[PDB]
Design a protein around this ligand. Structure first.
Ligand SMILES: [Ca+2]
Lengths: 49, 39
């Protein structure tokens, strides 16, 4: 897998609508391209992908 | 080019090995269209 490091977040937009109304761009420093699993550990917000 | 067989070069103008899982994935990942061509 990628050695993802320096992961940081900013939320570009957020509406607390019933759909996926928030968008969060994730800045990261990898060592290779690859598929990373992504998850949100706090149930206040569920990710789409 | 010709990286480890889990990677393919997504182009020929410059070396760019990327995951084979991205071939015909639905988007061009690189400077050259051979993700999606003639799957
Ligand atoms: Ca692709």
């Amino acid at each position: 897998a990628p050695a993802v490091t320096d992961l940081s977040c900013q939320v570009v937009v957020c509406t607390h609508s019933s759909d996926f109304g928030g968008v969060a761009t994730l800045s990261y420093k990898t060592d290779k391209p690859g598929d990373c699993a992504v998850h949100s550990h706090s149930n206040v917000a569920t990710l789409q992908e | 080019r010709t990286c480890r067989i889990h990677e393919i070069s997504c182009g020929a103008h410059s070396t760019q090995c990327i995951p084979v899982s991205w071939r015909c994935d639905g988007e061009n990942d690189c400077d050259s269209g051979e993700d999606e061509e003639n799957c």
